[PDB]
RNA sequence: UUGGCACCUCGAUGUCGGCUCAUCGCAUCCUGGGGCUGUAGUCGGUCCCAAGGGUUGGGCUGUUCGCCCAUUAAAGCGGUACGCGAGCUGGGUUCAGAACGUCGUGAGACAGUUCGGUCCCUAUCCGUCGUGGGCGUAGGAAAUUUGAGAGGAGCUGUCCUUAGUACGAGAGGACCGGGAUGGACAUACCUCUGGUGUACCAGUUGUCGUGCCAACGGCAUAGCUGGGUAGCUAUGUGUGGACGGGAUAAGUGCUGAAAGCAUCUAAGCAUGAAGCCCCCCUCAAGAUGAGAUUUCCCAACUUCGGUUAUAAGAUCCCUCAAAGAUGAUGAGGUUAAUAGGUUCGAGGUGGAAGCAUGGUGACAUGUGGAGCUGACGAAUACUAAUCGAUCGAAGACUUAAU
């Protein structure tokens, strides 16, 4: 569950460090989001140098929420923090060096570029 | 919050047609005594 | 076609093929007999009626419902049978099968069939407006004295009355409801149960009516 | 004995070959993944946090730190997608539910042996 | 279970004061709904008496109060000793029950249904 | 809308915006069906039919209004005392205080700013939501039903194929069809993920007490803390609405005269919208028009004026919950498992007391997956559902077939 005005951590080297959501896009009346959904957000904290600068309005994809996902066999997965990767709207990333583990469920979001760059996919 | 008209004698009497009371159970004390209440114990005026 | 009666037992889960997990309601459908065949000539519509669960015979000083009475005895004797508790009618079936006095066994359904289930709901008692209907509640601070009441109930003096169908509080309660397009997943013959995929209305040891899907 | 018809129906779908464990033990779970064409197996190693439920609907949960990030993972006990479970190390704890490990870090979140 | 119109801490105290005096006097008179509830409390306490070991002697002392009985022939025993001494003898063959409830009429000040509960 | 008139209301019609809850119109924002186009295609413009459903979250302002940020298929215009204060706020403004600017000789004022400033009422009638008693329905009862009528539901996107085809210089890029998956909404349910869980288990602080140790109890928000059954639950798990038939709207037509031509019309025959009626779900014979099928039961006195006892069947009374404000509903009443207890289990907690051993001691290990256990499951008449009482029919006349 990720609403508007939730802080997320950014998990690549694109320059941003923390971000907060403006809309959960999708359909009208949409309220929350999970792993594999795309949100639109503003950077609140940045690394000096880097591509993105503080105050930019970007689009991003959710990896690893805290309340995770149910799978068809009745298995679950859960993480300790919320994370996020800024995309170029091709469903391709801005940075190059995704950090931390990434959930499997965005394989079928056509995010294969993100899956290949990452460490352990569980 | 306050009644707009008084209530007549008929409308008062139609209202309390169910404001009644019922007769009790009334079994008997078969050994010795007068009537007791049903599923109770005939202690006084009763031996059951 | 394919009507049967039974009562709810509980709810479990079953691992399907390739490890998929599916929630399952188990229904015991035991000792159903055909009890009267109705006809368009005699009655005006074709149907059969089915009795579900048998009960004890006639006794002289019965004080409850688990003994049949004399009207129920003679009705359940004209078809050679024991007196039943629940009796319903099924007018979707073909009436040219089902001789009177047959036992409709539990394996008239095969795994894979789509069905509809009918029962009465749980029942909640006297309930207010935000529980019984899905109403939004008022603010809980900032000086409000409006929390769980309903809102306005009409206009001012044009329409100096309240229209009907206004959604006030009252008895939430259990009334009849059907769910559609379920499935039969596994039929057990020895225990005489049916496993259906999903959940059905009613409390435990209730009464459900299973019949085939109309769509 | 939940209800006589419930255990009679779901008896056949209940595995037998699993070892015994209680929370605080370290387990290696060989789970098998159907890929696009193959049936590749993968191992998940962690510490058992809890066990709950009864009968067919039993469930346990193991916890792992992958890349500085804690990962919980939760399974049905009798599922056919778990191939094998090994008990790597016995533990010495005093709770039935080990939820206090969620708010620890470093070497402070360690469990003794036996 | 019932609430008896009391708070959780008051209901527990009223229910073990009531169960003690049923051991002392062996038949008491009270209302209907209170006697339905002390029915199950006092019979779980005779089950502790029929076992008779130390650990259930410790467990029955969680519930009973500290009351002395002026027994006959000028002897004196506590309420706990009387439970493991005499009541455990009378019911060593019976497998439950141990109590009965006899109804009476209402009281005068209320319409409260009086009830005698006795020890059998 | 701003106004004109001054007809009700001055022995009070008592308030701008916002909240909650709605209902109607259509001069239609989206979706549906068509015509014309200066419509190649994809997009658009304009007009016609159409009111079934749907018609967003924030920043600044008391604000209506308006500007902006992001989305959406779309972010429509109006009525209902500028809908709704005996349903809520009270920021604004016609109250008493105070201050700035301006005017005034002055007391004071502006309609110009600013800070602060008390929102009453136990619902009689109509009305609405839910639930019961009485009588009736040409004998009396139990059970299953028909359905005159009424209510509900009615939304929509993205992707993949057709096909990089048609069209086009190219750039670009389809109709018509066929599949998959979502958003919002509505209903049912607790196997799962989670919440709660004040008569469940465990640890722990202070003080008083059970004569002392040891083990226990009371009070401190349930003393606090960690877990947690049943049941009640959503943020969780299932399912629903894009179907089909008939008649139509705008419109397109066939044949065809009046008017030797032509003409969709005058007579005749077709087609055509998510709108109309059916189809789906629910209530429904107090439908005084009171319906239908199956089964059960049948009296004498008699001044038949009514009395008496009664059948089938119900109820009083008692034990209860799958139901419940009460009442009704349902499970049961000794030829009995309705509740309680007892025994055995499930699940929950997590290794009791006592004893022994090791250790200076705090403590640890063993006996032993121990002991305790509310609501859940099965068995068992040990306790209690005793004995009894009440109500309850006796098939009207006319006519025609028989
Ligand atoms: Mg009167
Ligand atoms: Mg709200
Ligand atoms: Mg206390
Ligand atoms: Mg005017
Ligand atoms: Mg005037
Ligand atoms: Mg004049
Ligand atoms: Mg007046
Ligand atoms: Mg129009
Ligand atoms: Mg702010
Ligand atoms: Mg107004
Ligand atoms: Mg008003
Ligand atoms: Mg002043
Ligand atoms: Mg001056
Ligand atoms: Mg002040
Ligand atoms: Mg202020
Ligand atoms: Mg002010
Ligand atoms: Mg459960
Ligand atoms: Mg002392
Ligand atoms: Mg001590
Ligand atoms: Mg004290
Ligand atoms: Mg607690
Ligand atoms: Mg029960």
From Swiss-Prot, chain A:
In its keyword annotation, does this UniProt entry include Protein transport?
no
Family of this protein:
Belongs to the universal ribosomal protein uL14 family.
Sorted keywords for this record are: Ribonucleoprotein, Ribosomal protein, RNA-binding, rRNA-binding
Gene Ontology CC: cytosolic large ribosomal subunit
One GO MF annotation is: structural constituent of ribosome
Query: Known InterPro entries for this protein?
Result: Ribosomal_uL14, Ribosomal_uL14_bac-type, Ribosomal_uL14_CS, Ribosomal_uL14_sf
Gene3D superfamilies (UniProt xref): Ribosomal protein L14 (2.40.150.20)
- Name this protein carries in UniProt: Large ribosomal subunit protein uL14
Keyword Mitochondrion carried by entry = no
Biological processes per GO annotation: translation
What the protein does comes down to: Binds to 23S rRNA. Forms part of two intersubunit bridges in the 70S ribosome.
UniProt-listed Pfam families: Ribosomal_L14
Subunit description? Part of the 50S ribosomal subunit. Forms a cluster with proteins L3 and L19. In the 70S ribosome, L14 and L19 interact and together make contacts with the 16S rRNA in bridges B5 and B8.
Curated annotation (Swiss-Prot), chain C:
For molecular function, the Gene Ontology terms on record are: rRNA binding; structural constituent of ribosome
**Gene3D superfamilies linked to this entry:** 3.30.160.810, Translation factors (2.40.30.10)
Q: Looking at the UniProt record for this protein, which Gene Ontology cellular component terms does it annotate, in alphabetical order?
A: cytosolic large ribosomal subunit
User: Keywords for this entry?
Assistant: Ribonucleoprotein, Ribosomal protein, RNA-binding, rRNA-binding
A biological process (GO) of this protein is:
translation
Q: Cite the Pfam families for this sequence.
A: Ribosomal_L3
PROSITE patterns given in the database record: RIBOSOMAL_L3 (PS00474)
UniProt xrefs under InterPro entries? Ribosomal_uL3, Ribosomal_uL3_bac/org-type, Ribosomal_uL3_CS, Transl_B-barrel_sf
Under SUPFAM superfamilies, the record lists: Translation proteins
The UniProt annotation puts the region (Disordered) at 129-155
Similarity remark: Belongs to the universal ribosomal protein uL3 family.
* Entry function: One of the primary rRNA binding proteins, it binds directly near the 3'-end of the 23S rRNA, where it nucleates assembly of the 50S subunit.
HAMAP family linked: Ribosomal_uL3_B (MF_01325_B)
PANTHER family from the entry? 50S RIBOSOMAL PROTEIN L3 (PTHR11229), LARGE RIBOSOMAL SUBUNIT PROTEIN UL3C (PTHR11229:SF16)
Subunit relationships: Part of the 50S ribosomal subunit. Forms a cluster with proteins L14 and L19.
Its protein name is: Large ribosomal subunit protein uL3
UniProtKB/Swiss-Prot annotation, chain D:
Query: What domain of life is recorded for the organism?
Result: Bacteria
Q: Name one GO molecular function term.
A: structural constituent of ribosome
> Per UniProt, what is one Pfam family of this protein?
Ribosomal_L19
Per UniProt, the keywords (alphabetical) are: Ribonucleoprotein, Ribosomal protein
Which GO BP terms sit in this record?
translation
Q: Does the keyword Coiled coil apply?
A: no
GO CC, alphabetical: cytosolic large ribosomal subunit
**Which family, according to UniProt?**
Belongs to the bacterial ribosomal protein bL19 family.
Function (record text): This protein is located at the 30S-50S ribosomal subunit interface and may play a role in the structure and function of the aminoacyl-tRNA binding site.
Listed name of the protein:
Large ribosomal subunit protein bL19
The organism of origin for this protein: Staphylococcus aureus (strain bovine RF122 / ET3-1)
Q: What is the lineage of its organism?
A: Bacteria, Bacillati, Bacillota, Bacilli, Bacillales
Curated annotation (Swiss-Prot), chain E:
Q: Name one GO biological process term.
A: translation
Molecular-function GO terms, alphabetical? structural constituent of ribosome
Sorted UniProt keywords: Ribonucleoprotein, Ribosomal protein
InterPro entries from the UniProt entry = Ribosomal_bL17, Ribosomal_bL17_CS, Ribosomal_bL17_sf
Q: Its GO CC terms? A: cytosolic large ribosomal subunit
A Pfam family recorded for this sequence: Ribosomal_L17
According to the lineage, what is the superkingdom?
Bacteria
Keyword Ribosomal protein present in the record's keywords: the answer is yes
* SUPFAM superfamilies assigned to the protein according to its UniProt record, in alphabetical order: Prokaryotic ribosomal protein L17
Query: What does the similarity note say?
Result: Belongs to the bacterial ribosomal protein bL17 family.
NCBIfam families (alphabetical): L17
Q: What assembly does the database describe for this protein?
A: Part of the 50S ribosomal subunit. Contacts protein L32.
HAMAP family recorded for this chain? Ribosomal_bL17
Protein name in UniProt: Large ribosomal subunit protein bL17
Chain's gene name: rplQ
